[PDB]
Amino acid sequence: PNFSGNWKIIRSENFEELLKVLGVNVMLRKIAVAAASKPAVEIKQEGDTFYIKESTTVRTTEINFKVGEEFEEQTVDGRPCKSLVKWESENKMVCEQKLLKGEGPKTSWTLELTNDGELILTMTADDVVCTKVYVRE
What we know:
Lipocalin, ten-stranded antiparallel beta sheet, 10 strands, transport, ubl conjugation, monomer, nucleus, retinoid binding, mainly beta
């Protein structure tokens, strides 16, 4: 499976409620949600090594990791964390996140590529799941 590409969002479900349950205030949710309607996700995969950049109008995040090796990133609500990605199957990776400072809800995310060329991101915080689906440009 090759995740490399420029990805455009085609579905999103439960994003704002995910932010809400994480205690993100209304002002910021509105902005995040407005802005997340027009994102850009760029992925460069070389075997188990990945570079992933997401951009909205108001935020940008970039990560470089190798499956199986711990790296630093942020939770969906902007909290610094140590992450580890593992392959669940040939086309699906899963990431467990641990906060660097303090405690909080258990967060994770997964990325899977479908046979039809769609990229499915799920993000979970405890028992609230958000799904987003992308296609290549």
